[PDB]
Amino acid sequence: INPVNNRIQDLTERSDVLRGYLDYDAKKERLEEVNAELEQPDVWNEPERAQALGKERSSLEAVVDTLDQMKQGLEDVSGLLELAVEADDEETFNEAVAELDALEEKLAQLEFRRMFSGEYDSADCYLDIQAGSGGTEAQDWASMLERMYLRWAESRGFKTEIIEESEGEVAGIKSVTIKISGDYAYGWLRTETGVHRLVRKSPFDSGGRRHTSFSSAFVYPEVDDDIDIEINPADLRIDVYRTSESAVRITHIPTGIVTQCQNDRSQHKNKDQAMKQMKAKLYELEMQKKNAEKQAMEDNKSDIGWGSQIRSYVLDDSRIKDLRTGVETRNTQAVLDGSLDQFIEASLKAGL
RNA sequence: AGCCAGGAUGUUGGCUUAGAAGCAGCCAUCAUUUAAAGAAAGCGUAAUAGCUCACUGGUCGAGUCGGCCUGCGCGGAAGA
RNA sequence: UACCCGCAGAAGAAGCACCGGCUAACUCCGUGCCAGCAGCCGCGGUAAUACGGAGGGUGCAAGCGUUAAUCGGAAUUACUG
RNA sequence: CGCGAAGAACCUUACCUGGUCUUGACAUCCACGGAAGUUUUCAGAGAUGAGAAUGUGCCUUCGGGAACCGUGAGACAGGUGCUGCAUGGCUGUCGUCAGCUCGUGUUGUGAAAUGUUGGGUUAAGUCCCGCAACGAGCGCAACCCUUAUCCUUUGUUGCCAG
RNA sequence: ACGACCAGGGCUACACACGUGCUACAAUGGCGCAUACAAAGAGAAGCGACCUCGCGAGAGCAAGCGGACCUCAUAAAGUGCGUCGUAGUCCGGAUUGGAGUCUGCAACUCGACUCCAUGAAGUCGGAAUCGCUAGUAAUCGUGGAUCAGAAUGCCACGGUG
RNA sequence: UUCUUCUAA
Ligand SMILES: [Mg+2]
Fold this sequence. Notes:
It is classed as ribosome. This protein is of the alpha+beta class. 47% of the residues lie in helices and 16% in strands. It is built from nine helices and twelve strands. Helix 2 (24-39) packs across helix 3 (47-85). It binds five RNA strands through residues 44, 47-48, 50-52, 54-55, 134-137, 199, 201-202, 204-212, 309, 312, 314, 316-319, 323, 330-331.
């Protein structure tokens, strides 16, 4: 009963936490009007507007009513815990044990529906990182950020896969494209595009003078064979490079952006990758613009476009600080092992 | 041939929707008061409903039906 | 009208800028090359008298700062020089 | 880079993986309860769980304390967590390199220069001479430890010529 | 809990790269026998004679000694005699098998050692590069620290030169 | 005889 009573408590604890994060009254005050608009039979005279109101009314309802059913079923747990203790029956005692568990899973999906309320979360994504303009500092600095997500998607458990591998000569790597793969990999990584800043005293410096570096991050969902727009082969620059003669360089001229594939000994599959690369890249270039037409450039990761300081990494002090949410940590290497996931949910539970 | 009547029981299969009901539909498609009537022919509904079919008997009082072999046709088949 | 008389009671009546040096006046805290500041030298890349806030202190005063503009300083067109 | 670490089978050990704990393993304070101590059992990988007899050393008109346990309450603990560009301490390095400086003095507007230079000389800013410098300090030398030889002393567990 | 404990693991992994070492590639050597030859330490839960057995590692007995007394503890190269006779060797010993000794709760990871078997590479090492100026280089042993056990390391010590 | 270059508190 000692885990069970905390399993009454800690379950009900996070229940009211989610009640704030919905702002389900802003759903419900809309809903209650939409309910009054529904039972108004004038909603049916435009039956298109009826389902646009009423199937939305159903969409407004059960998302709110989950949390209502969360508090209501937890009342029956402690009531059966009352009937567990004042009448010591081991069934009702274990009914306080067993039927308690069925509560959270109602919220556990819906909080997952609330956290991943973003639309193309369920797809996976690709990764696009260049070393910044720090210098030889930066090339290493990308290769650190290389393994950080490698260990992350190892730890989070996604299929890592090097689409493209470019290098800095003296230190680290210059730029990279990698296929991440699995459930909600764009669900995670959509909140982590852009600037990652190195600040440490430079061994590359002849003295130990404190220099600064940067790197890029860019995340775009795997949405080819899901998005209907086809790449025009004219802006699709046909260009060939080599394996690491079979590799295919694609330069999308009008938006000036590129994508590649390097590994396939068959040249077509380097291209067959790069079609999947670029069509996913064009749609993200559309959908970053599209959530910029939602209100403004606000419902994406605020203002990516090189204002993306969303995490910045300080090493001599060994502090790592988020910027799009602003959550901090000292366990710098754990984040380099992939405790960057705490920053992802920092974006998601803040609603970014 | 028409013509009179019905055209059914439910779990209106689940679905998942626009509400999904023989009839948008993924999908089973049963039992059922049976003269018969299908988890249905189509149309219709926003869906149901509405029309309506198969169907069944009532009426009708000679055949009826569409195959195949062919004979000759016919359309297709507009120019300075 | 000036001007005077009573009435009433502390009553109805103070703010703005500044404090790294230049230049009179400082600490605390937020903050970490960000946000910013700034006439100049120049500040802020975790301990900021230079940022922001606090308290404190300086400077004016029904004003106080900023900008604009002028000559001075500038002997920096040097008659003087 | 046979470095920390003069010596990781567990220990060490900080690490990894599970089992565990939250005034805590460790201090002090505080009350509360039992002398402390002593033996055993199972449960448990063990951390620990319930058993099992015991005890009264020390003082008192003595909570049973002073001894030691356990409980409560917290004040507090704890950190091999960060920072050797916040530090002390300590250490390498140039390098046992011969250099580094000061005082007053004079010189230059001054920064500075002078001496400390120059010449002979030394392993050495070592010495001498010259010397607007003259002095002083730290030094590079000497004092020290050992060995090289001799004398005296004492001669056992050391010595054996006679 | 960046705190406290416990077990097990790991710190010893392993395509690699480098430093520092050690041992060899032999005949000035190997082997065998015989034999001359130290210095400096350590020692009480320690050193442990002697004896016994164990091929050996050891065990058992068990003195002695806080040590100029006893023990660790014969130094080793050397020398003398023989042997190998220029070969992957009677060089050299890697590796591995089997059987043990021993430490310590306990030797899988992950100890040390004995014995038997095994007999790799290696036949003087690129460009380069290190040390050292006299008891030095060179090579010969020995002790100590640390330490249940566990040193080619380290710290010392004498031998030849 | 020949021989260069040293990111940005
Ligand atoms: Mg080397």
